[PDB]
Design a protein around this ligand. Sequence first.
Ligand SMILES: CCCCCCCC/C=C\CCCCCCCC(=O)OC[C@H](O)CO
Lengths: 83, 82
Amino acid sequence: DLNNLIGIIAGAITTSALIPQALKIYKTKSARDVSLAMFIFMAIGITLWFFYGVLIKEIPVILANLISLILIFLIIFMKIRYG
Amino acid sequence: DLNNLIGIIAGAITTSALIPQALKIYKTKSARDVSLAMFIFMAIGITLWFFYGVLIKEIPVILANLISLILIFLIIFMKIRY
Ligand SMILES: CCCCCCCC/C=C\CCCCCCCC(=O)OC[C@H](O)CO
């Protein structure tokens, strides 16, 4: 399936993109310059993208968003912890 | 109908969510903690989500990701200036 392959690949990449931001905050224990607003609103939007994926029945949309949400929450947690 | 309502609303939220990070770098003139790798990888991935949207023919996926790409380059630009 061409569509899902591309979808999984897009989602593998956008979700994993969050890992370097997480690791950086963790390694340096600082996130002063990181925008909390961005991740706050990203989280809600991403939760809506999840719902959307469920309605149109598309697994790559579903998966990428659930997992990004976990990773985004880490980032939010470290922004608050190292503040 | 319902589908477009959620997609568009999602796309409006996640796309606009990128704006505060650009504004923050510009206002504080600092981007040390911001990860350049994250945004480079997001650009590539979002670019693929755009292809995906066209393939599965979902306009909210297509449009949200195009506007997002512009904003990500915008962010990348200010990460580098500061
Ligand atoms: C179909 C979707 C396409 C429409 C997308 C609309 C959303 C973009 C909004 C703002 C970003 C544009 C900002 C323009 C670029 C700003 C960077 C700049 O001006 O740099 C200054 C100069 O390079 C240094 O002196």
